Amino acid sequence: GSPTFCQGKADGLYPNPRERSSFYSCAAGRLFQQSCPTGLVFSNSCKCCTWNGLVPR
């Protein structure tokens, strides 16, 4: 059948299965797969991507 991955889903970002810093994004039930390239990391708590503020060095 047709893919149901974003069907009925609310908007916002969802976690990716393989790459280091890409995400899934849902907009009006349509799926986008995009990257967060520079300093940006995905946060599962906000369904958003944000700049990393923690330096462990």
CB count in 10 Å sphere of residue 23: 21
Method: NMR
42-49: long-range pairs with CB below 8 Å, 24+: 42/13, 42/15, 42/16, 44/15, 47/12, 47/13, 47/14, 48/12, 48/13, 49/13, 49/23
Are the CB atoms for 40 and 50 separated by under 8 Å? Answer: yes
- Per-domain residue ranges of the chain: 1-57
